[PDB]
């Protein structure tokens, strides 16, 4: 520390603004701060999960769900920035961020406060956690320094960004791209696509189904997998199915489910589908799921099968031999931050009716789009020489100097004014010459 | 070199054990070490070759192919990591790695040719033993007529630094109704991308057969080791009624052997005077990939319903197909490809491998529960001390393919400190 | 800092007392402080917004506006300067000023969890933000410390007057001028002058207006705009009318809507007005708008026409043709100041029947009247170089510094022991001779 | 302290990460953070206990009794470690520990008045205790920092885990052990053997029994005594019968007694010994208790004695004598922190239906099970010298320093920023070579 260093300030206190990060992708860009603010309703429960994407390029921010009587989580609503990045800008690169979660109300009614925090980081995606219970977060990782345990709700907790990976690539925001069309609800976007991530599902293998006749047909669930997106996707692939049986017709729907279990999305990839005698019958997948059709994170999808007979009977033994993959593409997907960091922020005895308050800071490197860059002037990052190496030696020494990705806010305080021991005006530039 | 510098030693000398990469790629990681133990029968005509992919960033090692009395190579068996990485973590970088090939029995025993070509599989035009020695003009990067008893050493060398993590081809949770159903998240950034125009108004004539007549519309080289898949479309226009038309796509390895057919059209009508499409939606998983992928071709069967003595079947067909390799443009994925290639060993003795790859790692969530991951440790002038080596690779001779012993005398020439740890242990 | 600096100190820290501007504004002056106090009554929304002017050259503080049940806003009071400025003063000049905003107090110097605080200072007048919601607010500016997200109510807000432009004149205050007159309810004063804002209004360029008669008449909104007045202001121009249809007559009203989209000023412009065929019928606007009539802050003008026959019958056809433009002088509005940066305080979720607490101090270069002048000395303020370039370092590094308009007013409390760590008594003085 | 001294680091602040044990006891292991996060509910009495095993080297953190109206204790859980390391582990050592009690119920919004807590560090373990009650704790030590009175709830205490011997063995965690059987509740483990603890209970020397016979037998209890036990045991011995009278059938069931007096273990140990008049009659005891069917903490054992009879029917009298010794092996019981130091924390006046909340770090040295093993790099410890020595040195100034086994948590915490005034990043590494 020497003065100090703009990039550590803003990395360790992302409150204090924006800086450039000092790797080497070296574009002309513009830094920019975008706050967090929410007020949410605690339920019935008094108890509820906040999912943050730490390392989201862009204006998602996070996801809060209410935890409900049968054990379910709820939807409740998307946390973002303050204003929606890709309307400004076409490309993106986070610089840092923090958001702090306390409450801020009790209740007409209500004696005492009560109410108390768990919290991890998670090294993965949302749906790739195997416990989400506000007991179970804690062993989500082995880190100690990316879990805090019963922080008191008033107190709160403090969510720190911490890197994975510099020199990434600026991403693309999901911004609208000048198009006209007949159909007012057209919608035209270029898309966060660097880095996908894919996942192939082989649905079957010479897969066997055998069933009885039935009026309105018979539905299975072939597969049901895992995935996570927040942003657009695709489904890229194809089913075979042979037969036997004559005058068999196959409907065939994709659905991509959220967090709480709800259906986000429902999409028929084949309905209505004569299968012929003695020959392969394809069913090919030619599935894209744009941004704004994404109401909640996805967090699996499943394949059913409708199987029905023109004619039908009593007993007449409908079946089909099935084989074939699918791909799930789901764009940027893989870009460090895009799906992989995970935040949870789990409350629980909270009063119902009482107030949850999120506030944060997001600092990023912005690219402007078109109407904006002819007033937006850009700029190369500030050269600092040893910015990087620093970085490098704070992190080295994380677990030693404590630096946490969930605090106790009051620790995070502590913390601030610990390091921060220095911001000196500036002396004798004043007295110089 | 003082004490020395953990990478260097990872990078030179992998079997020393794992270093963190000291690039810009910050992220909470562990480090590992797999070994590589494979016992190899040589065949017939005492001659083979083992194909090292040295910057895979996975479990893949390579593969190991006889040579036959017709000249043609047989595929014998991958080489593996010790253990299956998919299973334990899902992101991957490569440090470093060396591989060790030697014999060990005899039923002294015929010779090494070895390169490393910057390219891969696919694109080698001579893998013959004496072929080899021209695949790069890098003096360091082939080594000739080495002992076989003696050995060689491979080094992998890197292909770039400040790389991504890559997803190894992990397990996703799943259920459904197929036992034989596999899930799972796959390398893909980076994806390689071939496009084939396969025909533009091609025309084709043929007589009538019962069975109909089959065609090789095209055939292309291409790599795979883990999934890939195809997309684009065929076009056909006809004048002749009645036609039927059946395509498949052939995926054939380095031996010549069908590792993959699938069928992309059966049985399919065409009609006059109109565009017959023909869609190509193919995704074809890791795990049906039995070898490495080196070509690809599609036939086409073209049939009539009637059918006589003299009916000439003619269409005309247009379009481009996309293959991508996922992942597949990954420094390392596919592309440096060192080749050890052995002959005159007599037949049935032991070609011994043995290796050390070492990985920044990111465990799975099972075991993110157990396994503490941290960011690297933080030394300066790492990677300047790594360029610089690099920089001056020819004139230190450092090769990626040695005669062993003269790596063996390289090591110790290198590696001249290592000095315990002085006055820790009397300061205060 | 070497003892301190006077300026910067009363910059920093207003409620320390006032000190002379270092600029080149060299008058015979004298300082002053004067506090605001306020106890607001929050509304049955539990929400609702304070508008402060924190470079305003005079008594006036802010307004603040209850959020009510249907979601609109509704005007409550003026804050204002514990005393009349203009009652005692001629002249003055904005030093520096800082407001506190909170609720709630128990016992032990403890406060209670009460709701969350959005605040803004925004480089506009108050008619020009596009948005004024709780949520919106947060970015009516990009630039961070300018802005503050959900801070508990019981903590507080600190509103802090950051200069926009030095060398600044004098400003008069609305002060009475001697004068006697036939009318009980007759009023003069010299107003804030120098630097008038002004806004032209094109209305019409041949507005064509055409409709059927009805008894009564018909009304119609020819314009509304946006535009800002405190103070006195004036509008003048003309509309010119033209005619085929001979027996029409024209009444023309100007209304001056207030924040709260209520009427603060009406003013009849011409009422009962024939017009004649063939000839341009001409409508003067003569309207000066005293001080005391603006109840709240004006937001925006319209103009109402009203077309009436008398004579009509069945289904008879008005129609004029209407050019000309107008001018509205607001006196003294582009005084950098009295109009121009806005700073809100939002609050959301207050316990209803809880009192948000307002308490300020603002300090002021001032000229007494002729009455206080003969028992007031004034002088040119202390000389102390290197006073303005330290003003301007530390402007220059605002951001880096963390010195906000806006402050969680925890954070300005620390700020404020971090900052001023000198005040150091005076060593030997007391021993020297 | 320079820089400072990773174990004493870890050893006085818990939560802050694990180091090496820098003693002589050098295994290849892995270093490994464990939290415990509860949130217990007050009963009717607003009074009850939570009994800590600060030294245990496992999961098994503490229990929590309430009081009961009849001022009986009545167990609630068990508390426990995150995840259960013997899943995982086969060995452990313990290096650190802290905990924290505290009531997450503040009344009013603000206020820590809810209640008291008194603690203690007791040097034996739990059963060896004479007085448990809330005023009672506070003599079980002589040494003023192993106890504290009547902390204010709301503040909350913390309890800090001091060592009792260096140099011990890792400690065989109850890790499960590859076994097939034909019983699905088949259970096999290897347990924590090293220093067991033994009781021998000389139950009779020549006891004279005798009582008139009843249908269905005659039950007595030979004895009972004060044991201790978390974790699997076995009893050893024998009891031998003399009698005059023909056709008496013994049965013998052992009761383990929770420490609420419940029973949580009953097993019959002889069933049908039938007694030979005038000769030794043999009553092995051949017990093996596994931990899992410990559910709370054993208190005691007691020891019953059935005596039924062929044809027995009116004044048909029942005499038998005898003599033996019992041995009770608890296993690893002797292994300093399985069962000896105890730290109580009582709370009473609490509220009922409000939350204490226990928030917890354990720190360990562990070896991975077999399978865990092929993915978990094991070293020996960080070396440094002076580490142990600094130790030593600190703990023999423990009470001029002031180091507790129970605080004020706010002592603590002013402790903790007074100690490790150090953690100075790294001075020129960063600018070296
Ligand atoms: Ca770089
Ligand atoms: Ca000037």
Known sequence: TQQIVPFIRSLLMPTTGPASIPDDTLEKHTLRSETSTYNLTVGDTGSGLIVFFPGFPGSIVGAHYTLQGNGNYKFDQMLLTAQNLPASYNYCRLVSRSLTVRSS???GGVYALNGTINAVTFQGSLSELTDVSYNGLMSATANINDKIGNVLVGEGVTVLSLPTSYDLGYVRLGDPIPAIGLDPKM??????????????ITAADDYQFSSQYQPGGVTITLFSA??????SLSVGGELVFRT?????????????????????????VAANNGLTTGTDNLMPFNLVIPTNEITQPITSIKLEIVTSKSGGQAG???????????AVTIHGGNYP????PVTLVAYERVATGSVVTVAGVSNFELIPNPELAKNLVTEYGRFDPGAMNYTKLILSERDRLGIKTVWPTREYTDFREYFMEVADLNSPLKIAG
Not at 226 to 231: E, G, L, M, Q, S
Not at 248 to 262: C, K, M, N, R, S
Not at 337 to 340: E, P, V
């Open 105 to 107: 109300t009790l209740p």
């Open 187 to 200: 919608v035209a976007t270029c898309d966060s696509s660097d880095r996908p991530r894919v996942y192939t």
């Open 226 to 231: 895992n995935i996570d997106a927040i942003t």
């Open 244 to 268: 036997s049986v004559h005058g068999l017709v196959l409907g065939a729907t994709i659905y991509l489910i959220g967090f709480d279990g709800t259906t986000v999305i429902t999409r028929a």
């Open 316 to 326: 007449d033994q409908m079946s089909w031999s099935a084989r074939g993959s699918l």
């Open 337 to 340: 931050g895009a799906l992989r």
